[PDB]
Enzyme design. Structure first.
Site, mmCIF file in Angstrom:
data_model
loop_
_atom_site.group_PDB
_atom_site.id
_atom_site.type_symbol
_atom_site.label_atom_id
_atom_site.label_comp_id
_atom_site.label_asym_id
_atom_site.label_seq_id
_atom_site.Cartn_x
_atom_site.Cartn_y
_atom_site.Cartn_z
ATOM 1 N N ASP A 121 -2.956 2.353 3.495
ATOM 2 C CA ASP A 121 -2.855 3.601 4.234
ATOM 3 C C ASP A 121 -3.876 3.735 5.376
ATOM 4 O OD1 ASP A 121 -2.187 6.272 4.929
ATOM 5 O OD2 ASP A 121 -3.269 7.123 3.232
ATOM 6 N N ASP A 144 -0.419 5.813 11.570
ATOM 7 C CA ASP A 144 -0.472 5.970 10.111
ATOM 8 C C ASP A 144 0.564 5.168 9.290
ATOM 9 O OD1 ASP A 144 -0.829 6.953 7.520
ATOM 10 O OD2 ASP A 144 -0.210 9.025 8.010
HETATM 11 C C1 LIG Z 1 -3.067 10.034 1.485
HETATM 12 C C2 LIG Z 1 -1.636 10.170 2.037
HETATM 13 C C3 LIG Z 1 -0.580 9.548 1.084
HETATM 14 C C4 LIG Z 1 0.290 8.508 1.471
HETATM 15 C C5 LIG Z 1 1.279 8.013 0.628
HETATM 16 C C6 LIG Z 1 1.435 8.535 -0.673
HETATM 17 F F1 LIG Z 1 2.452 8.112 -1.457
HETATM 18 C C7 LIG Z 1 0.584 9.550 -1.136
HETATM 19 C C8 LIG Z 1 -0.396 10.049 -0.247
HETATM 20 F F2 LIG Z 1 -1.122 11.065 -0.717
HETATM 21 C C9 LIG Z 1 -1.298 11.651 2.274
HETATM 22 C C10 LIG Z 1 0.044 11.862 2.953
HETATM 23 S S1 LIG Z 1 0.127 11.127 4.597
HETATM 24 C C11 LIG Z 1 -1.039 9.778 4.353
HETATM 25 N N1 LIG Z 1 -1.186 9.030 5.462
HETATM 26 N N2 LIG Z 1 -1.694 9.436 3.305
#
Ligand SMILES: C[C@@]1(c2ccc(F)cc2F)CCSC(N)=N1
Ligand code: NA
Ligand code: NA
Length: 371
Positions: free
Chosen positions: A36, A221
């Site tokens: 991520d 992202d």
């Molecule tokens: C940490 C987070 C995340 C990504 C995938 C997932 F499956 C769970 C997540 F919490 C927040 C939502 S947008 C992002 N870039 N990262």
């Protein structure tokens, strides 16, 4: 240049993210970790949650150290809370190193883990500024670079469609892209923040104040599936895509990601949909470059049924897997810049392909950033 060991080291499922195999503790415990670039914590499941294939068992590790501190991480969707600590980490299909990194052992979560997914954690690759609880919890990549000779750089080739890809840690692999790499400056080291200076739907400008493209930010992202646009930009772009694709009609709920749309297998109208171009700030004054995506990237398969993978956002522009799957992306942390090149694995047709073109002359590019 050449990093065969790390090539094809990412796996996944469409919409469920991209993960790398990692090891934590002594003796090594193998876990699948979601890559991520939109977060900065290394958080792994540490309890027998029913959706998990495996989890970090601290009791089995001799090298584990307790930081005697907790962390509560809420999101719009999910939520997770855990116990901070450090231990030894390695990436089997990565560099031949071992680092002492911070690990958030997830003890409680809500809508975080995916039922049916093959990952048990998250590797936040962004900067300390957005780390939880605060900027003193050193992110993994910062520990990796500080404790080893691995250069302050990593690159991502996200291929898409059961999905695959590559994470080249500490370098670039020239077999993963065609043409030239074009670089955009990282505006600030928190998220991988960039500046969009122009938007074209099939060669035609949206003619909006460029400050609107970055309200309140624009980020790269790997953890978001969609191309997320600020509401104003989204309305403009949809109105333009809708017009360019009026040859076949669709429900208005579909553009809003509330309904799917379906056709026949082997005959999906690709050519009725326009290409989307984002112009990014270049390395030189008044110089930009542009990246072009195909409907193949923003029409996400769910006979066939697709989803409109472009959506509104109140957090800014999010250059998610929709953008990243058309390109080989270089997160050149050492030089505070992000590189884009046409991916050797992107999904296209006999007509159109993703493109990275430059240079272009764009004046007042600094005014495109939100303060
Ligand atoms: C940490 C987070 C995340 C990504 C995938 C997932 F499956 C769970 C997540 F919490 C927040 C939502 S947008 C992002 N870039 N990262
Ligand atoms: Na090349
Ligand atoms: Na929002």
């Amino acid at each position: 240049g050449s990093f065969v060991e790390m090539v094809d080291n990412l796996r996944g499922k469409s919409g469920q993210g991209y993960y790398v195999e990692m090891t934590v503790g002594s003796p090594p415990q193998t876990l699948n970790i979601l890559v991520d670039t939109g977060s900065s914590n290394f958080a792994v499941g540490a309890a027998p949650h029913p959706f998990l294939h495996r989890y970090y068992q601290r009791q089995l590790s001799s090298t584990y150290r307790d930081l005697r501190k907790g962390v509560y991480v809420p999101y719009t969707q999910g939520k997770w809370e855990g116990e901070l600590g450090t231990d030894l980490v390695s990436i089997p299909h990565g560099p031949n190193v071992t680092v002492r990194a911070n690990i958030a052992a997830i003890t409680e979560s809500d809508k975080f883990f995916i039922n049916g997914s093959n990952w048990e954690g998250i590797l936040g690759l962004a900067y300390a500024e957005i780390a939880r609880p605060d900027d003193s919890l050193e992110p993994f990549f910062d520990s990796l670079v500080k404790q080893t000779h691995v250069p302050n750089l990593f690159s991502l080739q996200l291929c898409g469609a059961s999905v695959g890809g590559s994470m080249i840690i500490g370098g670039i692999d020239h077999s993963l892209y065609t043409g030239s790499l074009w670089y955009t400056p990282i505006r600030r080291e928190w998220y991988y923040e960039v500046i969009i200076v122009r938007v074209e739907i099939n060669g035609q400008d949206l003619k909006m104040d460029c400050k609107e493209y970055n309200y309140d930010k624009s980020i790269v992202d790997s953890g978001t599936t969609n191309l997320r646009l600020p509401k104003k930009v989204f309305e403009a772009a949809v109105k333009s895509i809708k017009a360019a694709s009026s040859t076949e009609k669709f429900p208005d709920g579909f553009w809003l990601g509330e309904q799917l749309v379906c056709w026949q297998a082997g005959t999906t109208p690709w050519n009725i949909f326009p290409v989307i171009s984002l112009y990014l700030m270049g390395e030189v004054t008044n110089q930009s470059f542009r990246i072009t995506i195909l409907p193949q990237q923003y029409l996400r398969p769910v006979d066939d049924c697709y989803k409109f993978a472009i959506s509104q956002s109140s957090t800014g522009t999010v250059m998610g897997a929709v953008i990243m799957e058309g390109f080989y992306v270089v997160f050149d942390r050492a030089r505070k810049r992000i590189g884009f090149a046409v991916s050797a694995c992107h999904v296209h047709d006999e007509f159109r392909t993703a493109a990275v073109e430059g240079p272009f002359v764009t004046l007042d590019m600094e005014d495109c950033g939100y303060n």
